[PDB]
Amino acid sequence: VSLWETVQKWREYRRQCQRSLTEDPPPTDLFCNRTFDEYACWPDGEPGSFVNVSCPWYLPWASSVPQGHVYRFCTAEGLWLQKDNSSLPWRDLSECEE
């Protein structure tokens, strides 16, 4: 365990997300927008479906949750599901917990 090592792996994960965000081809006209939320990298979402991404590989316990995914939901309006009083969209990260 090392805080510097985890921060560097997080910087690397962020960098790989920024590569995808800029380089992946555009999607239909309606989709939830790809984004990095500081915890996980999200692709463009299909309206009306859950969106899965693997637990982020910089987590120190990533190897204890090798099959874990984290989830968002992309509404039929093409907006990530989000409560009015939350500054972050809805996310289920229970499969990535220590």
């Binding site: 090392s2 500081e38 915890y39 120190p60 500054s87 990260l93 220590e98």
Partner: protein, 36 residues
């Protein structure tokens, strides 16, 4: 913190720092402008 001064202390402490860093990330910390 009784019984805390162990050889394991310095590592137990880095481990909590990494845990807090991850919690901060889950809160959007690096880019958040929210009041403290």
């Amino acid at each position: 913190x009784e019984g805390x001064f162990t050889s394991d202390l310095s590592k137990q402490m880095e481990e909590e720092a990494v845990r807090l860093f991850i919690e901060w990330l889950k809160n959007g910390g690096p880019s958040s402008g929210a009041p403290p």
